[PDB]
Design a protein around this ligand. Structure first.
Ligand SMILES: *[C@@H](CS(C)(=O)=O)[C@H](Cc1ccc(CN)cc1)NC(=O)[C@H](CO)NC(=O)[C@H](CC(C)C)NC(=O)[C@H](Cc1ccccc1)N=[N+]=[N-]
Ligand SMILES: *[C@@H](CS(C)(=O)=O)[C@H](Cc1ccc(CN)cc1)NC(=O)[C@H](CO)NC(=O)[C@H](CC(C)C)NC(=O)[C@H](Cc1ccccc1)N=[N+]=[N-]
Ligand SMILES: [Mg+2]
Ligand SMILES: [Mg+2]
Ligand SMILES: [Mg+2]
Ligand SMILES: [Mg+2]
Lengths: 212, 226, 195, 233, 204, 196, 222, 196, 195
């Protein structure tokens, strides 16, 4: 599992891999680790597959109830805190979650909140979560600037997950990309690593460690 | 594993299934669990396969050298005594469970040996995870003065009981018949009740289906010479 | 000991090794050289359990130096690494194993090629273009996967190594007090004094 | 969570053409001590069902009372209690299976393995197993404990699949059960010679046989067996 | 902690018509971390091929040990060792470490130079021999390989068909195991020519 | 296991059941637990079958070598060799052995060697898991200088009860009679002893 | 100590076609090295053109199926006999499973049916209710043996167009019901050879717009 | 502890030793283990003294309240109340109780309730640590419809052996006779029973 | 959370708190403010178990803010610290205790005096001239014992605090990524943005 989200001049980039494991058994290569809460909110999933799906789907229901009651879109801060306060109630029971709540609102601008199952809630510009986070961080921190083109930023997020998918045994399958703007989130496709890797190797001239 | 041995009119017979397992997977579908010791002494093995194999080969090797030294046919009690003293020494760490049977100048004999070094004498015995299935059959049908034809039937039936009803045991039935005054006859694949049925499809691929990065010739010979 | 990195470029091998020596609560030293010269063109960096690291390194150093005097000849980096691997592979089934991981950087004067070997405490040897031990690799391999080329100069190798060290200084929890860098090439071994 | 104290061993059973047979020995063991020699472990419910129970005897006696209480309760405001609204094997089983699974799910199991044998209203054979975990299964032959390992192999030689059931008569089936009980007496260290056997037939009804004994035992060969290898006397 | 699944990797061997094939992945890891994508697990001593999965230090050690033993064998016997004899040598050597074993899953493959008979064999870590007519599997994805081989395999395949079958057995098994993959090698072995092929596979 | 040795007027009788269990499974229902270490020195074995067989085989070896050099050993000498093995290897053995023998000088003698490796000379001895149930019966019914027929009945009735109550005991009752007349083997089947 | 869980073995397999779906499972039920039954049905018709199997610990499997069947019954009562769609069934099962998050149903659950466009659908759950819609899924003891085969044969993985070097993948196709059943049968025959817990019989439930049909095939009994 | 209840022609007799131990120390050498839950329904206690006293006190309370409402309870009813407490609280109790009583309708009856909380109606029952040593003796010597003097001798001889072999048992042999005639207490001292 | 320091000088209280947030392998953030304003003249810094720290701090903040509105009055630093101590002392015998250590720095407007309270997760309260939690005190108390005077200015307090942070940066193994410093005086709470 490799998930990442970062803030830049043109909004937020969110990229995730698609692998699920049960130990060394590769359970699936086609898993969805991004939940679309509403047109302006995204949730990334790392940790327990059930724990993330269930509670992030539940979060979406709580975000919907907020906008019915208040006639207004829930803030990223408020949404992240509903989830962080929930997991905190269950603390010690054994829930396993690493997640990022990413969205735009007029009052906040583009915002990212890291939330996890031991009750941590952090606001920030860059986060990587999961077994492959260190690999993603390596690529991301080196080529990160505030003012990338939306095209370059999308590539970096994609490339950072690819780097982790390669090195981390428990990450892989495919890369799902998102871009969050003033107007909402936009899906930028599913990219199979078994095709992307070779494409990137040739065009970029990277991955010289591999027999190609 | 289902291994068994029983005596009949002028001989002793051993039986065994042919499945080797690692946890729940079948490692080997056709393996020989009836080990050789002397020309007329055989050993059914259960427990740890490497251990059962190694201990019989070692005692068999020493039995051969003993036979050469004394200029006599080896006795089943010699194999028995050597096996048990070795197994006892290692305190069950060599996890071999064995049924030893054979013919010698003293007569026909049937023994069982346990990993800790204990031995039994019996007219019919069974060991392994299928022992209870086999022993149920042997207890229902064994009698004194069985003919060879009845004995092979009963032995193979006892092994079959294990094959069908025990998950540990499977595939084919091996038998070895040791009769007084005759050559021992070893009957591998005596029964074959578990042949795989023909497949629905052929999964043979079109050539060039697999993507290849490089090709090369491996030099396996000594010195390509001038 | 914490971070040891290695990178093999066109004409040299560069080994970077952290300076900190921490015993539990306090940082006892911030200038420790976690390396031994085995022969004029072969350098070994090391990390692992306290005491065992230096004892092992110096024991290897003595044996290679003894070989050099006996034969009036420098063993190839490959031969040195195979000797080191066997000692570790012998060690792992001992009463008390050496808990030491090493990188061996050497310039083979016969083949005119730099060579980098990574060997862990079990005796697991691998020849690599770049390598690391412990948690270092988790951060640095993704960078090196991205930026490495086999035809890099020594200066480009050092710039790529700065980027690795900056990433480690950003994201690792422990303060490893910077790195001592050493270059192994045809002319021998030298230390980069400003890094 | 507990541990079983006084215990009953194998219950064995099989289907035949017109009904079912079930059997179980009359022993209540206290570890290795063969403490109680007069324990009935087959408990009839009406004239169409027999519940055979192994495992903990105190939990068996609890189950026995639940079944006795079930018959009473079924009779309440039920003019057809001895006719169309009588208790079926399938009703008695599902009740027990519910109880067993509920008890394991509260981490306080009834430490038993149960076989419900009977004949339904429409003449169908009923034979189903349930244990302390709430695990249930049906088969032409069923057995608990040592019976599973020794009786089933023998009983499956008579009825190996569903299509063998109409070919098996009550004499052949009872013979197989009685032989299996002898085999268990030879080989199960916590069994006894005395047992009870019940036949539930769709024509002749419930025949309950008490104080049976294992007979025609082969021991004579023992006199010739001497030592543990090399001894000749 | 489990030594046989720290480094990861797989070997599979198959018989065909007058030929054998042996194949392996190229990954060496430290649990989740991938370290090397060039770690070959198949070696050869004359015309006998040995694949070894398991703990990588023992893979290397045993290769060096069997090279040693087969070199001395050749000097004394004045001929290259045969697959059947080598199989017994592997078994002997593993079992002599019965109570401190090498954590490996060796696989022998080769053609007997005199009889021309294709031969494959597998072992557990203490030397129990499994001599198979059809195929042998080994490694962290041995279950996956058993599934592939048991369905894909048919007897008496020609060398260039056998290549496709063994390659697809390896590749699809490796893609369902986290600790296998990162490249693969397939040896096609005939009585007096051996072809080695590197496969293109997904690098995750 | 239920085992006992009983001295009487003419000599001594050893008695045993025939059941060997692995947990609740009866591994062997016709075991011979009465084992010969010398012509007229026998023993009853209880505990680990591997251990008691290994010991008995060593003792037989020692008494065979004793006989080659010094003539027939006493029953006391046999009991001492058993004791030496059991006591010196007490940390690695689970053996409870009764040694019984006939001299012409000493007549019938019985020695019991429990887990610790102590020796105890007794008029009669009982041992094994099934012996716990017959301490009361044996104490009340044993007399010294019984006839052969009385001692056979005493053992038969005793082991019958031991078998009845102990699940670890069962099968046939084997006996071995040791007198001046020689060595006589007896066997008694379930249908005989169960109805007592 | 009392262990509330057990392992009854077995293996199950769901495959989604273009306008159909299959859910297959072996009929063997085991504990340890003993066979409990050679024919104990594991795949169930739950109504509303949905088939279900919960493989693993059979008591938790039976409990779950029983509860889902009841959930279908009460969905009819509460929502005017409305047909429970496969996607709605799946979400309902997630909540059943997650309700026991801290004392799980020790089962791998698969359901099969048709989506609201009439296309074939398979859904697969972990023990605590994480789910995904899939085209292909094996569950249970021999899932490790069967799944790589299905990746290769159903989804055409690692297979390339011959002569393209390795740059045009084999293109994805829907399989016919006859083709799917051949792959199902060969999967279980193969699994039976190498896994000791798989055998005795194979029962396949096929779901189309016309309803639920059954097929039974013998497997090796060793 | 050695305890037993034995039915006979005229009714039933309960018997017990008098030793209570804390490890190897004898805390009380004159304990009364025969305890009254109703006029002619008594019980023998074994296991945890705290637990068996707590149970017996609750049973006495239940049978007293039963008698106020419904008249004299049967021995079966008393055994059922004992069982209900023992079975429902099996996780927190270590109690082995023998219940014995005299009706005029049913005459002498004996019920044993071991650790699990099961009930067993028997002609006689034995329990406690010392009972293991007299299973053989009691089975061989018990007859149905014995006289009072025979049953007193049977209990005296039995518990004498139990006491002899069991360290946890000892002291005096107490007995309580339950017949139509009434309730008679008997006591037998070491100097009487040891020489049997 | 790692290092929290406090120093009470003549006319103010200075709280210094580390910026790093580490979750195991990686440093997730390097600008984290480990403090809450409880009232205009009372600041509480905190460190301890993840999640519990912020949950506790914000729970205290809400209660003090509720008191302020109800009474239209600011509680004294002493009163706030006693409230906080009782909550922690109640906590320690709960089903799941708050694992949180705090420093409470306040300016008492009635007495015209700065006040620093140190309270650990057990509810152990002490008023001090300078304080720390966890391993920080092992290094810094010896400095403060040497250099502290009660009549120090705020600028002298900050220089003394730089010397504490430099010592921690030299001798502690963990990289705590510098400190956020805040001053509490008669005019309220302000952050020193350059440190
Ligand atoms: C990677 C997280 S990691 C390796 O960095 O910890 C993924 C992230 C992820 C996957 C899937 C989804 C949504 N479907 C969202 C995020 N997480 C996983 O791979 C986890 C790692 O533990 N995998 C699981 O939770 C698996 C998923 C199944 C599909 C295989 N499930 C299990 O491991 C459970 C464990 C369990 C639970 C209860 C009882 C018994 C066993 N099932 N199993 N086995
Ligand atoms: C049945 C014995 S049983 C189930 O009743 O205990 C067979 C008997 C047998 C098989 C093969 C041979 C060959 N000469 C002789 C006798 N035994 C087995 O199937 C054993 C059961 O443990 N199988 C093995 O020992 C397998 C053999 C395969 C590798 C070929 N080995 C493993 O499973 C190893 C061994 C192992 C050994 C000792 C203790 C634990 C594990 N495990 N691994 N890896
Ligand atoms: Mg990977
Ligand atoms: Mg992989
Ligand atoms: Mg008995
Ligand atoms: Mg099978």
């Amino acid at each position: 599992t490799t998930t990442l989200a970062f803030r830049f001049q043109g909004g937020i980039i969110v990229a995730v891999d698609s692998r699920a494991t049960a130990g060394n058994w590769v359970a699936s290569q086609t898993v969805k680790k991004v939940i679309e809460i509403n047109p302006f909110l995204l949730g990334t999933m790392a940790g327990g597959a059930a724990d993330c799906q269930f509670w992030e789907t539940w979060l979406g229901s709580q975000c919907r109830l907020h906008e019915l009651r208040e006639k207004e879109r829930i803030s990223v801060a408020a949404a992240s805190k509903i989830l962080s306060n929930l997991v905190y109630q269950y603390k010690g029971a054994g829930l396993s979650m690493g997640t990022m709540i990413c969205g735009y609102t007029r009052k906040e601008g583009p915002t990212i909140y890291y939330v996890d199952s031991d009750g941590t809630r952090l606001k920030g510009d860059i986060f990587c979560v999961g077994s492959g986070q260190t690999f993603a961080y390596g690529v991301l921190d080196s080529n990160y600037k505030w003012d990338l083109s939306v095209e370059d930023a999308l590539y970096l997020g994609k490339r950072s997950i690819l780097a982790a998918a390669h090195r981390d045994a428990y990450s892989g399958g495919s890369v799902n990309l998102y871009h969050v703007t003033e107007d909402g989130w936009i899906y930028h496709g599913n990219h199979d690593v078994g095709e992307l890797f070779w494409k990137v190797k040739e065009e970029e001239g990277s991955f010289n460690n591999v027999i190609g | 594993t289902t291994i068994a041995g029983l005596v009949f009119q002028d001989g002793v017979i051993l039986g065994a299934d042919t499945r080797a397992t690692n946890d729940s997977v079948v490692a080997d579908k056709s393996c020989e669990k009836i080990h050789f010791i002397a020309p007329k002494i055989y050993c059914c093995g259960a427990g740890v396969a490497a251990d059962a194999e190694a201990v019989t080969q070692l005692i068999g090797s020493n039995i051969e050298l003993h036979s050469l030294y004394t200029s006599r046919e080896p006795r089943v009690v010699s194999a028995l005594q050597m096996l048990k003293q070795h197994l006892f020494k290692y305190q069950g760490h060599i996890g071999a469970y064995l049924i030893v049977a054979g013919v010698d100048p003293t007569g026909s004999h049937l023994f069982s040996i346990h990993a800790h070094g204990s031995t039994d004498v019996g007219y019919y015995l069974s060991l392994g995870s299928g022992s209870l299935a086999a022993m149920a059959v042997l207890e229902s049908h064994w009698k004194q003065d069985l003919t060879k034809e009845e004995a092979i039937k009963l032995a193979s039936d006892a092994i079959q009981a294990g094959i069908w009803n025990d998950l540990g045991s499977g595939s084919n039935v091996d038998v070895c018949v040791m009769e007084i005054g005759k050559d021992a006859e070893y009957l591998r694949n005596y029964l074959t009740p578990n042949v795989r049925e023909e497949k629905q499809k052929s999964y043979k691929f079109p050539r060039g289906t697999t993507a290849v990065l490089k090709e090369s010739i491996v030099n396996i010979c000594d010195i390509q010479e001038e | 000991m914490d971070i040891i990195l290695g990178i093999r470029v066109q004409d040299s091998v560069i080994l970077a090794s952290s300076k900190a020596v921490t015993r539990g609560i306090s940082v006892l030293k911030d200038s420790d050289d976690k390396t031994r010269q085995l022969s004029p063109h072969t350098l070994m960096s090391f990390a692992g359990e306290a005491g065992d690291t230096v004892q092992f390194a110096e024991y290897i150093q003595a044996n290679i130096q003894l070989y050099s005097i006996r034969e009036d000849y420098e063993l190839s980096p490959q031969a040195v690494s195979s000797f080191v691997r066997q000692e570790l592979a012998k060690s792992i089934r001992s009463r008390r194993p050496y808990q030491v991981n090493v990188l061996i950087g050497g310039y083979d004067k016969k083949k005119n090629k730099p060579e980098l070997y990574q060997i862990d405490y079990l005796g697991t040897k691998v020849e690599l273009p770049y390598g690391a031990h412990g948690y270092s690799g988790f951060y640095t391999f993704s960078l090196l996967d991205h930026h490495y080329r086999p035809d890099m100069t020594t200066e480009e190798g050092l710039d790529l190594l700065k980027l690795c060290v900056q990433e480690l200084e950003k994201r690792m929890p422990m303060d490893f007090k910077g790195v001592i860098v050493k270059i192994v090439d045809k002319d021998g071994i030298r230390q980069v004094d400003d890094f | 969570t507990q541990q079983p104290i006084v215990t009953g061993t194998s219950v064995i059973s099989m289907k035949y053409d017109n009904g079912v047979i079930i059997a179980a020995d009359n022993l209540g063991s206290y570890g290795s001590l063969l403490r109680f020699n007069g324990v009935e472990r087959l408990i009839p419910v009406g004239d169409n069902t027999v519940v055979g129970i192994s495992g903990d005897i105190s939990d068996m006696q609890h189950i026995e009372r639940l079944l006795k209480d079930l018959v009473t309760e079924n009779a309440y405001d039920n003019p057809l209690a001895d006719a169309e609204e009588a208790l079926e094997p399938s009703y008695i089983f599902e009740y027990l299976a519910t109880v067993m699974y509920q008890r394991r799910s509260k981490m306080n199991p009834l430490w038993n393995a149960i076989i419900v044998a009977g004949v339904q209203s429409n003449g169908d054979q009923f034979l189903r197993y349930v244990n302390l975990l709430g695990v249930t299964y049906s088969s032409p032959t069923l057995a608990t404990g040592f019976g599973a390992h020794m009786a089933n192999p023998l009983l499956r030689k008579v009825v190996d699949r569903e299509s063998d059931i109409p070919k098996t008569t009550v004499q052949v089936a009872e013979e197989a059960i009685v032989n299996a009980m002898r085999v268990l007496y030879y080989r199960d260290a916590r069994s006894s010679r005395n047992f009870s056997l019940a036949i539930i037939d769709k024509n002749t009804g419930l025949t309950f046989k008490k104080n049976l004994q294992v007979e025609n035992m082969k021991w004579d060969f023992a006199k010739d067996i001497k030592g543990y290898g090399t001894q000749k006397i | 902690s489990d030594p046989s699944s720290i480094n990861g990797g797989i070997v599979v061997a198959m018989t065909g018509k007058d030929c054998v094939a042996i194949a392996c992945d190229l990954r060496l890891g430290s649990q989740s971390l991938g370290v090397s994508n060039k770690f070959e697990k198949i070696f050869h001593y004359g015309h006998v091929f040995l694949g070894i999965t398991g703990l990588a230090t023992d893979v290397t050690t045993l290769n060096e040990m069997f090279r040693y033993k087969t070199n001395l064998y050749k000097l004394k016997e004045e001929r290259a060792i045969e697959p059947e004899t080598f199989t017994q040598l592997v078994s002997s050597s593993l079992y002599e470490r019965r109570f401190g074993p090498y954590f490996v899953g060796p696989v022998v493959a080769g053609i007997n130079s005199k009889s021309g008979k294709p031969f494959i064999a597998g072992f557990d870590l203490i030397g129990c021999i499994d001599e198979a007519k059809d195929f042998i599997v080994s490694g962290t994805a041995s279950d996956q390989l058993f599934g592939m081989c048991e369905s894909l395999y048919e007897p008496n395949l020609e060398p260039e068909d056998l290549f496709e079958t063994i390659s697809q057995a390896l590749l699809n098994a490796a893609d369902r195991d986290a600790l296998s993959g990162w490249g693969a090698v397939v040896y096609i072995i005939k009585k007096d020519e051996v072809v080695k092929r590197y496969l293109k596979m997904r690098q995750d | 296991t239920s085992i006992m040795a009983v001295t009487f007027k003419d000599g001594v009788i050893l008695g045993a059941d025939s059941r060997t269990t692995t947990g609740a499974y009866i591994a062997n229902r016709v075991t011979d637990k009465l084992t010969r270490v010398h012509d007229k020195i026998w023993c009853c074995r209880s505990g680990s079958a591997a251990d008691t067989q290994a010991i008995a085989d060593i003792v037989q070896y020692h008494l065979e070598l004793y006989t080659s050099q010094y003539g027939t050993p006493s029953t006391e000498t046999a009991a001492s060799v058993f004791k030496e093995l059991c006591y010196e290897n007490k940390d690695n053995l689970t053996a409870g052995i009764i040694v019984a023998g006939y001299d012409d000088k000493n007549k019938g003698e019985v020695y019991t060697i429990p887990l610790g490796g102590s020796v105890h000379k007794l008029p009669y001895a009982i041992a094994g898991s099934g012996s716990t149930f017959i301490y009361g019966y044996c104490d009340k019914n044993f007399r010294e200088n019984m006839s052969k027929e009385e001692t056979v009945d005493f053992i038969k009735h005793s082991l019958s009860q031991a078998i009845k109550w102990d699940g670890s005991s069962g099968g046939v009752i084997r006996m071995v009679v040791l007198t001046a007349a020689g060595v006589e083997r007896l066997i008694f089947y379930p249908d005989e002893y169960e109805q007592l | 100590q009392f262990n509330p869980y057990g392992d009854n073995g077995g293996t199950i397999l769901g495959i989604a076609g273009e306008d159909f779906a299959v859910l297959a499972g072996d009929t063997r039920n085991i504990t340890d090295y003993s066979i409990n039954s050679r024919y104990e049905p594991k795949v169930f018709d739950c109504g509303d053109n949905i088939v279900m199997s919960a493989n693993g610990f059979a008591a938790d499997g039976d409990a779950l199926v029983k509860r889902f069947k009841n959930s279908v019954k009460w969905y009819h009562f509460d929502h005017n006999d409305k047909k429970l769609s496969i996607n709605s069934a799946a979400r309902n099962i997630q909540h059943l499973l997650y309700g026991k998050r801290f004392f799980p149903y020790y089962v791998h659950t698969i359901i099969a049916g048709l989506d609201e466009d009439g296309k074939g659908a398979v859904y697969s759950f972990d023990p605590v209710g994480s789910y995904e819609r899939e085209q292909c899924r094996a569950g249970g003891a021999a899932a490790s043996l069967i799944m790589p085969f299905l990746d290769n044969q159903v989804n055409f993985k690692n297979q390339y167009e011959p002569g393209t070097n390795g740059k045009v993948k084999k293109p994805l196709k829907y399989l016919s019901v006859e083709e799917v059943i051949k792959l199902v049968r060969d999967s279980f025959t193969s699994a039976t050879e190498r896994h000791i817990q798989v055998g005795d019989g194979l029962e396949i439930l096929i779901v189309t717009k016309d309803g639920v049909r059954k097929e039974f095939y013998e497997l090796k009994r060793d």
